[PDB]
From a paper:
FKBP51 has emerged as a promising drug target for chronic pain, obesity, and depression. Selectivity for FKBP51 can be achieved by targeting a transient conformation characterized by an outward flip of phenylalanine 67 (F67in and F67out).41−45 This conformation is rarely populated in the apo-state of FKBP51,46 but enables high selectivity vs FKBP52.47,48 To stabilize the transient binding pocket of FKBP51 (F67-out), we aimed to lock this conformation precisely by the formation of an intramolecular amide bond (sites displayed in Figure 1B).
This was expected to trap residue 67 in an out-like conformation and stabilize the β2-β3a-loop by a seven (i, i+7) or nine (i, i+9) amino acid macrocycle. Furthermore, for position 60, the size of the macrocycle was finetuned by incorporating ornithine (Orn) or diaminobutyric acid (Dab) as smaller lysine analogues. Protein crystallography of the ligand-bound proteins confirmed the desired 3D structure of the synthesized and refolded proteins FKBP5116–140 [name]/K58 (i, i+9) and [name]/[name] (i, i+7). The protein fold, the ligand binding mode, and the conformation of the β3-strand were identical to recombinant FKBP51. Notably, the side chains of [name]/K58 and F67K60 were well resolved, which unambiguously confirmed the desired lactam bridge and its F67-out mimicking conformation. In contrast, for the lactam-bridged variants, fragments resulting from cleavage between [name]/K58, [name]/[name], and [name]/K60Dab are undetectable because the covalent bond formed protects the protein from fragmentation at these sites. Lactamization within the protein was expected to shift the conformational equilibrium toward the F67-out-like conformation. When lysine is replaced by the smaller ornithine, up to 39-fold improvement is achieved.
Numbering used by the authors: 13 to 140
């Protein structure tokens, strides 16, 4: 499925090139701009543990999820990954624990050393 495609075909968007965050663009967005650190970003998403049937989704807020990019308001992989998206883009991200919750996890919801998968839509972003 979608995680396997990211493993085989996903681009490594980490600075260290350690495959900690792999990306596939699933729908191309508009324009050339991608958000800067400090910008307020608005997304829809769904997220899964790799090994589990439990899903989280912004569609249940029925509302955009909002955060300021590069301000440690989300896991590292999202500061890295969302920064690469254009407005209207939908991407898949496969995320190793070092760029999420690490060996600690976030118990009981997130286990130790969990890989995560997300589908993310960048709705909009605005300068601070
Ligand atoms: C800088 O590092 C951190 C910053 C923030 C956190 C908290 C979890 C942080 O979660 C995350 O960063 C990632 C990426 C964004 C979407 C949520 N997310 C998650 O892992 C999800 C998540 C994790 C959560 O807590 C761990 C959630 O809160 C209970 C949560 O609620 C909607 C959702 C996982 C859920 C299970 C399946 C795998 C996904 C979070 C959760 C909810 C809203 C957030 O920002 C917007 C807002 O506050 O309105 C930020 C952990 C961090 O490190 C582990």
């Amino acid at each position: 499925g979608a995680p396997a495609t990211v493993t085989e075909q996903g681009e490594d968007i980490t600075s260290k090139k350690d495959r900690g965050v792999l990306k596939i663009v699933k729908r191309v967005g508009n324009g050339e701009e991608t958000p800067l650190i400090g910008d307020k970003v608005y997304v829809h998403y769904k997220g899964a543990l790799s090994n589990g049937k439990k899903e989280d989704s912004s569609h249940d807020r029925n509302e955009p999820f909002v955060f300021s990019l590069g301000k440690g308001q989300v896991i590292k992989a999202w500061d890295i990954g969302v920064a690469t998206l254009k407005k209207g883009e939908i991407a898949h991200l496969l995320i190793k624990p070092e760029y999420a919750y690490g060996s600690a996890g976030s118990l009981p919801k997130i286990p130790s050393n969990a890989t995560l998968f997300f589908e993310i839509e960048l709705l909009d972003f605005k300068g601070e």
